[PDB]
Design a binder for these strands. Sequence first.
RNA 1: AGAGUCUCUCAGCUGGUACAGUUUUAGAGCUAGAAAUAGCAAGUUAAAAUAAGGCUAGUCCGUUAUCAACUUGAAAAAGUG
DNA 2: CAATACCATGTACTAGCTGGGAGACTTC
DNA 3: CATGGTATTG
Length: 1333
Amino acid sequence: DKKYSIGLAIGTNSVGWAVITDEYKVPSKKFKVLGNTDRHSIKKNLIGALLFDSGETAEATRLKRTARRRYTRRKNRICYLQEIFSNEMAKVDDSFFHRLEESFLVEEDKKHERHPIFGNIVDEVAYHEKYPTIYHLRKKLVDSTDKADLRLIYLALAHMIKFRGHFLIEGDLNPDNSDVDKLFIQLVQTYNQLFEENPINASGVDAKAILSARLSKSRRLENLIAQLPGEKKNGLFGNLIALSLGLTPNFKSNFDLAEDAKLQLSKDTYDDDLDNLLAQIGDQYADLFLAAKNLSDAILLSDILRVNTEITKAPLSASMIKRYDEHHQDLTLLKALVRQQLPEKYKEIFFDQSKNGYAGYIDGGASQEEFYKFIKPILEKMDGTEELLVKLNREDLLRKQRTFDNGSIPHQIHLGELHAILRRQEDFYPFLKDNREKIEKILTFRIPYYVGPLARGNSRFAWMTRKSEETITPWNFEEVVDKGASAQSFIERMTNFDKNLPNEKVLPKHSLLYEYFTVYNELTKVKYVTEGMRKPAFLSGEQKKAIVDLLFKTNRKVTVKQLKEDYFKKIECFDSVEISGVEDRFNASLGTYHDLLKIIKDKDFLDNEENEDILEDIVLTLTLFEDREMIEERLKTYAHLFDDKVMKQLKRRRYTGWGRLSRKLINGIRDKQSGKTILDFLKSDGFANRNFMQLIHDDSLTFKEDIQKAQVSGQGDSLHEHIANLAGSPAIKKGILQTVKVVDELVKVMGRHKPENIVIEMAREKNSRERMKRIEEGIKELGSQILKEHPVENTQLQNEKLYLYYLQNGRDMYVDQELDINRLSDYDVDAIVPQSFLKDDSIDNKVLTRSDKNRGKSDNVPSEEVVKKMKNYWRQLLNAKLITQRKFDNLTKAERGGLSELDKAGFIKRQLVETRQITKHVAQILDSRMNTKYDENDKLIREVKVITLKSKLVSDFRKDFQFYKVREINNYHHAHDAYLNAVVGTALIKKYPKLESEFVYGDKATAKYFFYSNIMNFFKTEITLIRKRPLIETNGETGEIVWDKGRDFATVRKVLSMPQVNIVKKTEVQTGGFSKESILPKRNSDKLIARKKDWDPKKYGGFDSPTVAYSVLVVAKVEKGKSKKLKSVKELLGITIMERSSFEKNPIDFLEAKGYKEVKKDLIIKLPKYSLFELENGRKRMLASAGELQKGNELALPSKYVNFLYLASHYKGSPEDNEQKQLFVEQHKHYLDEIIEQISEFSKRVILADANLDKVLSAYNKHRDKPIREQAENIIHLFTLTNLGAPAAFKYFDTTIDRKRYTSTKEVLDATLIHQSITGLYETRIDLSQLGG
RNA sequence: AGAGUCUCUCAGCUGGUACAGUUUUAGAGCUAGAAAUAGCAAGUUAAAAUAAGGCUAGUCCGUUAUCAACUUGAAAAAGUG
DNA sequence: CAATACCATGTACTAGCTGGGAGACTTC
DNA sequence: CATGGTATTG
Ligand SMILES: [K+]
Ligand SMILES: [K+]
Ligand SMILES: [K+]
Ligand SMILES: [K+]
Ligand SMILES: [K+]
Ligand SMILES: [K+]
Ligand SMILES: [K+]
Ligand SMILES: [K+]
Ligand SMILES: [K+]
Ligand SMILES: [K+]
Ligand SMILES: [K+]
Ligand SMILES: [K+]
Ligand SMILES: [K+]
Ligand SMILES: [K+]
Ligand SMILES: [K+]
Ligand SMILES: [K+]
Ligand SMILES: [K+]
Ligand SMILES: [Mg+2]
Ligand SMILES: [Mg+2]
């Protein structure tokens, strides 16, 4: 009998809720209170907001999981090696591997001698004197022919296997394969071969030192080009060198090309970009473009190998030894220099670990970069440091061997030294000869990504299947693991099934049948009309077939121009024809047909339908698999059909991506009477030319019937599962589930009566590192030198104007002029589509220009004149990916007619009608839970209307009727937003029931522009642009009242003024990492936690700062003093995340191990983070941990102070209304003192931070002569003192007030504990003072 | 609304791999002093751990999601104002 | 104790699938 | 970043 509606505000950290009646009033009930206190009930307003910490994604958990596997597998590699060495090492040294295992232990805990390698000090000291680094020993074992100690052989091989290098380069690799000098001359060889008239004199050019110099790519290009007179860097030879150096040269101008041949070897799409370039100028230049790829491999290896390969087979280890020797020489020189010239600074540089000198660089925590910054002025100030300063700016001064840049090293280089050492010593140790390939396999073998974890039924992540049930090793992997089935399962466990045929897997996106389907589906809706024709006609089956054979099978893309001339003129003899159903060019194309035509060069083979299954199977293999060996294995059934050259070219062709329909749907099932498949109808369908949508929905065909029969709906998801499968951030998905739980409780509160309406609004939704990468790639592709002229860091790009300055290459976007980086404050940021139409404030709709006036007119998109002169410059930014296609399309829309009136109408509509898919899902979830009954026609009975609104409706409502929000005052605005949503939503559909189609879930341009722009005017009494409306607005047809402008605004004002709002902070057990990850040094402190069971932190260091999973109230006795007399206690024990499983398995045994005796087991209270306690005078506290509290109260500032703070701070309409607001501020200037008074009384009652409050009062009394706006702006900051939750720092003007913390939880042990339901309407209060023996 | 296609873009989820960093130990400090300390020499490398750990013992698993209280119940859940 | 201060693992490469948003062609 | 852990200093 009692009718009501529900308003909801779904956020990432909050769910606001409110209940309203017919009169837009919020009810209030007496709610029973449970527990052991005086209070049996409490009065609650039916409005509030649930607060919760953000839901986290799974990414961090995944990165730690895979890192965990890599540590386990890296250890296994060492275990494999030691198992091979086991028997023979036992003869040489029967405890060598035992000393390595216990190297970490202190001598007290060591069971063997403390020197690992040899077991005595004399041999150990001699080893280090001969091999100061591991790379000295590695080089010796590679070069020497003498028999070596088996322990030194193990150390070298283990070092290579434990740190084996990356796997980014496929195939084999030998140093001196790519000598820069010998690969540069080969480039000059093949260049002068193709250009006999224009040759290059490369004599006297030291190509080795110029290209391998540790300089920037462009500088080395300029250096080499400077050595070639009459040759410019943008010429052909310069573009080849630039391609070898890794730049992005554009070969268009070299070969007078129409297509832009922009090449970069680094991209995976290169070898196709070469063939596009090779198709235009021929294959004679393939020798040239291949000689450059070789030279690039030489220059890359020259970065790693800085040593002449003709003296050693260990160029990497020799290069590390080169680091060591120059480090030794330069350190000797630096010490001698500093001792003579600056003797007083010597102790600071070489002894003080706290400083970034050499001591802090070797012993302290100073990095190479910090060390260079500390010592660069010291070298500049002294004399004789010129060579050291050169090495510093090359980042080659006093280098270590284990460094951050060693990620460049490929595993083939470590393998080369490993293989060489095995070759040297297998002559002396027979077991090395028999295990040479095994040891090499330990280094080279990696688990394929398409195989995954090698589990045996206990991994929810694994999909691998085994050919035989036995332990998988690197040597039996091919025999035990079914790589074929595993790699197939890797994709097929992720790919969609056909929704129409749920048992049929979807075709590959690049399958020939799929592209035939996409072309014929688009082609069948084309229409044409000529002179003699009465009306436009479809294309017949013969015409479509002719268009496919003549155009689609001869051109990769088919434009409309080609359709008019190459078919309608050549075949139909039409001089003029109008085409509909396609613009500019056809979207679909037969790309795979042309890919295979170039590879196999047999057009008749591709056109013969008998080969359809073979070609579909080939593309499937090329799509399913990425490993070229597995691809070759699958294609070997067709080896008899193609030459070996074609089979090799077929292997290289790989496809990714899957379509959305299955082969059985496209060309499998047949219409019963016609006997035709879907594709058959697309090829020919009389004169109806039905397409895919029409065919599967036509009742005169059997396709629709077979689709319904094939549907198989399985087990239903739970609510949580269904929400987890929604497409959205895990953060917003947390709010969605909480929203459903809130509604369930609100319905139970109303006696299981369902509401009339549910109105929902859903808020709209490192980063600087991506911005630098977007500009680096952009400027490099652009070829600009703006980063050379103006360097920048990633953090600076967070400035909106500077980020736009670089994305625009330092130029005005509307004028062909360059901008001044030091004058960005004078320039303007302009919206491409005006913000009055499109509320988009992203970089994608913004532009940096000198003056926004130059955009043209301000009521539309940039003018045609700007487009005519800036289109070429914008397209360069687009190709440089400095602007998106959408940004380019909006910038150029005026040449396509600009913003039409329909576009403006849609823009206003999209400001008010929510169309996000995630909001429709939330509406569908609530709608399906509320409406479950069906009527006589078996159609759903919609008792509950689920309405979705956008935030702009209420925010406009708040500003138009002075119901302002100030988020920093308290959390009430989340609840107030929900209330206003219910009021505005219900009143909107009451006034206009026709709008239910646009706002309720379930199944002229100037007119709609006017209509949707004036839709919210029925709330207003007068409307300028200067009409007037009645005081009472009613529905036109029903006559029912929807809004009373003399009594309903007062109701809304009373609701927003109610001080009692149910703000509930969701209590949550803390999960995640055990503690801080930092491995601290040893110290005498019980805070340290052992990193391993037997690693006493007093000897070994460890962790501290553990996270408390939840606190536990313990009432027990503890032993006291030397006598151990039992003493009754009541205290909070924080159970850490690491301790949680032990505590929950047996709580009494866990507590007794902590010291507690006679634990009152039934009085143990689980207290998660944010547990609520009430003390005296309404003061509340929340549990931050076991030893710290948070603020637990809300400051219910009266509405008059909130509205004043909004208007005074300029948180705005007609000028006279602005002056009225300005007059109201100065008339009520005394509100500033009353606001401070409200803060002071609240703070003295519940905050209890005497020093901070006195500091606040002094700061306010200090700036009383400041402007009212500035005082009001800084009063907003003061509410951080009174905000709910963790104390935080804030500054009033220029005075900073650090947070006052609640560093003790003793007082809550005698306070009242409050258990709240999700809405806080149901409470259980426990007087904890009644506990304690 | 829904569906297929084209172009661009953003996010979610899974797998494979590398480089550092840190921690303890090893890399004989010397000399003058009873010591306190001073003067000087030296430094670049390595082993091992990298969530404690778990049983299911795999070259597997261990940081996401989900969680007021109470009554049942082993739990799964349901119920309670 | 209270006030105060300091601290917090990071980078790089790479193979996929799925979904959301924007504009456009065709449809139910 | 933010805020809970930790030590230091009175
Ligand atoms: K109602
Ligand atoms: K990754
Ligand atoms: K010992
Ligand atoms: K070099
Ligand atoms: K030159
Ligand atoms: K250091
Ligand atoms: K190191
Ligand atoms: K098109
Ligand atoms: K593939
Ligand atoms: K053959
Ligand atoms: K300006
Ligand atoms: K959690
Ligand atoms: K030492
Ligand atoms: K939990
Ligand atoms: K709760
Ligand atoms: K990706
Ligand atoms: K996409
Ligand atoms: Mg481990
Ligand atoms: Mg290390």
